[PDB]
């Protein structure tokens, strides 16, 4: 049968579709351009779009109810919450009912699913199985359930996380963070205002607050958990310890009987410490792995000898932007990567029956007779001035780091209210279809200084950081050959007095911010990649990526608006355009006297001073004159 | 430089770049093996592997039949169909002992299935042989023709709608003294002729008629119910679940295989699997599975092997003779192979014809000795698993013990032993215990290497990483129904292909890109910005101009695609909902259109 | 009927019920009561299992908030909604973990508190009758049966209701709501041994289908029913000859042997269009898109060349029709001239049916069909393809073809479309991989072959379907986007179709293909065995010293193809997808072993290299940008030179490749029969150039890897 070829052939024919016999009562017999829509019934596909263009409107408020399943799925995705991508290496009887339940569930995963997988079995997760899991990777993904209706605190948290995660990689973290926070705005309100007013207790928001000098909580963040001190106090000795691979580390060991309430996203705990020992710890989690990680973090924080010698690898960890992190975080990350050795070497001992608190799992599954040391599963506020360091490391008067860019989660949420990140170095967070818009808007908003520097010190303008994001889109292979080309053109606007077009400068400027390379090519279109598609910017004319409307004098980039353009007093009026060809001046319109037009490939054979016509664009011909003087950067 | 892609294996392990070695992702444009030659050769081979059996003449069909069961034991490392009934029965008894109640529970489940299944279930299949036309027709047409002819001859119990009633009608038809077949032509077939017509396979290189399929379905249902309880079997499952079994087995044999116990994996392949399995032995094992059960259950389940063991085979289309000195191209139908002078053919074909001539009855060729591919695929796996179960270390009574996986002519065997002599003896016990049941391991397609790496039905396992290349890339093109259905199908194909047949995110995205290209090129619905000039461009252009929220336009209305991996399960009209203009929403989904897992989608003006 | 059960129950139960119906062959539309009963049972089971969780040694928890807890676990294990095989796995795990008799059938739940399997039911029928029926069917003690009723009646074995009264009341209220709604819709009231004998022909066929010794099916069944393992395998294994064994031959660094390629005259070209010896008469910026009329571009391109000369045969076919190949070209030129003189492009030029075209197309050479009765006496009759596996030895031209197919070009041949935004991190990784690959392969000659083949096969299939009885001249056009952004329209030659009455999709439609080129035939006359190569022009080319005139040749051949080949060639764009899958699997394996995303250390690392070459210096290493194109060219050549020999060789050599890999990994590989494997590999190498080249590559690999 091969229905695909049948459908292609049918769509080739005019009037392929079958419609009702009342179409004549609704749709015309010809459109504005005289193209027939139907005959005899049989209707061309043009009618299917004519109906969508000009047709009887109707209220569709009921569809979200008729198709409630699909729209429920759409809403679940829209409020999604993506975690990090984890690349995982594939390498009679007593038996109480609860032990039966554990042993069973732990046994099913072994022979049921191949890839380890963390958790998730309900249909809400199965529906996105093509995304959550793959051959050797996982895509941790919290479903878009109903969790509060803030709509402002959520957006503030997302903005703060983005700002911190973008500043941690910049050359100067604190300066970049201050710049971004002083410019971003959520829900119209400027970010600084909400920062001053909001009491939220997010890590990124608190870092941003400390950047402004505002007061933050004294709670200590570590491994994603907040250790609110509840009793006791001590000092840090700043000592050294040796590891299993014999790697000395300079840590800050505490002492004294200290009570710490470890709050978390999906687990809570109560810990007691006294001079590097876990006296007593209680846990209350949600999942088995949640409790597992909670105790891992608690033990790492305990700075116990057994914990330190439990290391079985290289404590070398790299932060984004190639930083070494801190020894405590090094141990935490190492023991998060591997678990069994730490737990087994931690030690085990018998428990005493107590109300509603089962003994921990020595490994894998819980137990009711023996538990790891001092760890028990169970059930059931002031501001201090701080100072941030260069690497966004908040600190207290005591000098102990409270919040660092490593406590900020990787949870890429979706903003509820509209967040505008005015400022460069962050136009990449939004889609690549927005980098072009923001780049052109920036070039327009600073047009006076850009023009002055272009006419005076072009090299420094070219090597500007605000054009770096644009350079991400341009193809690498031809990234340089464009620059040279464009650069040359601009020189031919500074040498040939009287020729100066603002539109050309604002169009081709971002293409000239890469190490130039010289070539003999006459480009007709500079290509830029957006969302996997290579769009084109025509050197001479208007393109969907860049359209300039003279009538209203407005610039449209990819449909969106960029702004308005004035006219330079130096703007040329003779019509001579110099930045459209490598070594030629477009002296005007078609001139049939000089002879038939020459293809842009043939004009390279013209000698100095020769003039001829060339097909320079879509069904267009112009007269070009070769420049006797040859200009080059 | 001279490019040598194979040299890439000098750096990356083979199992990592194993995809490089698979030439095609799709059905090639050529036919590999088919026709009269490759069917006569198969018949001759099947009879050769059992040549030392017992020759009889079938009273009813009247064709020679070879019975190798309980024949002479093999004497050389060459294929032999001389399955021993005692050995097979003992193997299945041991399989039952190691898995108590398996046969009983499977029999009860299948019995429940029998009394409910409708005749319609017999049309959800593939091409089938019409005994009323001596041709091949889809399943529905074959079933309809058979039912019509049965009604015309007085057999009408199938009107009940249950499949078992249709089987009863088939059995009654087998007893009638004359069957009248009236086609949209008037013909009458005596008992013998119709019996042959119902015991024949046409040219998986052979498809059974409609009489056999009814019982084959129930036998394979029992086989599937048995297989689902055996961890060794890997046929009833697929996709990610199969990838578990591999790991599982390697875990079972390496739990404590560290106290010097050498472990070795044989990646194997059974030679001439289909041409050695004996339907008489399938009967001998079905009579064992269905013990202490209602006589009707045993009778219904014992009729597929009974019909196979007497099965005939149609050779094929025939031969084509070409005279290059006269420029003539004539054709000889297979029915004339019983008398045509043996001078035209070449030597090999002449030998084939001479060897097969004694077995030619009514144009077919008796094929009692062996099974044919594609049928009893899940009942053969049970025999293989029973053999794999005889290495449990309680059934070998020695220091070497094997246990692995088998999937109907594809197996991987793990042969833990305390030293190399132990391995070489535990491989011999398997290769010999496995010859008594008629299974022939292929020595030219297997290899043994230390445990930690092997291949099982194209699931290449290497040190815990399983690469799944069993199934092929599906066609990422427009279905061809309409604008709305094609988008829903094409996206769903990519989704469920990513889930089941491991497909990379990047290749998934590029497949989506190619699908969008084909979609836009079939229905002329290029993007509004794009300058392609078709007959539908103008209307698409104007609609682009008057829409403020251009992102909400459907891909079929000259809008922008919005499909990435995260939203492949969402229909288009529901993905692009908030982005649409209210007037556009009303126009598209207006119930007053003059126009209006599969295709799960919302209805719009495009249908 | 079909609407209520659909609406009142969540979809999952609906799909489960439909799956059961398909399992039994039932259809939701045909029947109502069975679907309603299945959905009711599913919902009752789920609401029973969703009752509540367990706790620490006290159980009987009644908490329902929505916050999972470690020590709180479900008290009932769902089995009704689980898959068959996985359900059996679960129940077997239950029995192994704790001693409880295996249920005969799959139960519904496994309440842990009582450790007893639970089978639940609900049906309008009388409660006591249903309970007795279920006790008889599911016949076993130490289990539990719990039966509900719409009327508001419940029962269970031992009168030991497992759960709490409130949950039972909830179940009863749900049942009452269902029954009341159904009755208000006229639905509620709607709801209200086997024999099989083998006799006659089947009895006489069953008695004739047994092991040799037995005589009647009754005797066979009587023997089987009394069988008891007495050690039958042991005795027969003792009696079987010791020669029946599989001795493990060791596989050492010296055992591997180079394959043995065939011997004979060098292999000739086989593809359907000139691969590297192709010349394009391209025009830049044709003027606005819209799939320009092929026959208009085919004239606007041939107007670009002014060096047409008098055609001359430089290499005859040597077993064919040279003059009619020459005159077909001299007629194509005339026909193209006539189109120019006429007003408007016809959009399809049917060529005049003349003796030249008939003979070149082979229409006048094909043998006539004759019934066997007439041609009995003719002494030349022989089975078709009686014996012609003429073995032809490897030649270097295929290696040069691949070398040129792995090279970049100055154009952009594949223009893909857009994709939604990239939000998920996995989406970002996928986009990065895909963009790097597409950048590395967009400009390449393998993509040129992909698009040229797609265009040619599409324009040939469309004409073969539309015009079934005309010799339709078909240009071989392709379209690229030069590095400067200006679109071109390349013309490689012409194709003349023949009569194309294709009913079955395996009938051949002979067509004459005439390519342009600059490669002199006399350099490799053995590569052009099937072509009749002419000399048609003199093209000026920019040499080092000035501008030199070189001849322009036309390669003519009467080829043939069928709808299956056309459809297999129209989808050549899947070669990009296959190569991308290969590269991404190579990345995924390395990432899995390395526990991190290696998408960067592969594509952006100027030091990384893979050995993919061989020069006099030794094995040459390319960069990822060369692997991305080498694999793509390999796939394209697998698609172009597809053959059964290729499939056999690729299947049989992978085993040798894996044994070599096991050896290189030090796993002590051993083979049971290596000579047979080598014979199987070498059986495929007969005359296919691509397979011979692949065998040579395999030899070179073995040599370098095991040295």
Residue numbers in the entry:
A (entry chain F): 41 to 80, 89 to 139, 195 to 483, 491 to 743
B (entry chain E): 1 to 184, 208 to 226, 240 to 632, 655 to 665
C (entry chain D): 1 to 192, 202 to 716
The authors write:
FluPol, composed of the polymerase acidic (PA), polymerase basic 1 (PB1) and polymerase basic 2 (PB2) subunits, transcribes viral genes and replicates the vRNA in the nucleus of infected cells. Replication of avian IAVs in mammalian cells is hindered by species-specific variation in acidic nuclear phosphoprotein 32 (ANP32) proteins, which are essential for viral RNA genome replication. Here, we present cryo-electron microscopy structures of monomeric and dimeric avian H5N1 FluPolA with human ANP32B. All experiments presented in this study were carried out with H5N1 Tky05 FluPolA with the PB1 K577E and PA Q556R amino acid changes.
We next determined the structure of the Tky05 replication platform, comprising an asymmetric dimer of FluPolA and ANP32B, to a final resolution of 3.2 Å. In this complex, the active site of the FluPolR PAEndo domain is buried and thus cannot perform cleavage of capped host RNA, i.e. FluPolR is transcription incompetent. Its orientation is stabilised by the arrangement of the PB2-C domains: the PB2 mid-link (PB2Mid-link) and cap binding domain (PB2CBD) pack against the PB1 palm subdomain (PB1Palm) to form the product exit channel. In contrast, in FluPolE the PB2Lid flips over to mediate the stacking between PAEndo and PB2CBD via its C-terminal α-helix. To assume this configuration, PAEndo rotates by 70° so that its loop stacks against the PB2CBD domain, sandwiching the PB2Lid between the PAEndo α-helix and the PB2CBD domains. The interaction between FluPolR and FluPolE is predominantly mediated by their respective PB2 and PA subunits, forming a large interface. The PA-C domain and PB1 β-hairpin of FluPolE stack against the PB2N2 and PB2Mid-link domains of FluPolR, while the PB2627 domain of FluPolR interacts with the PA-C and the PB2627-NLS domains of FluPolE. However, in the replication platform, ANP32B interacts with the FluPolE PB2627domain, while we observe no direct contacts with FluPolR. Of note, the canonical mammalian adaptive residue PB2 K627 of FluPolE forms a salt bridge with ANP32B E151.
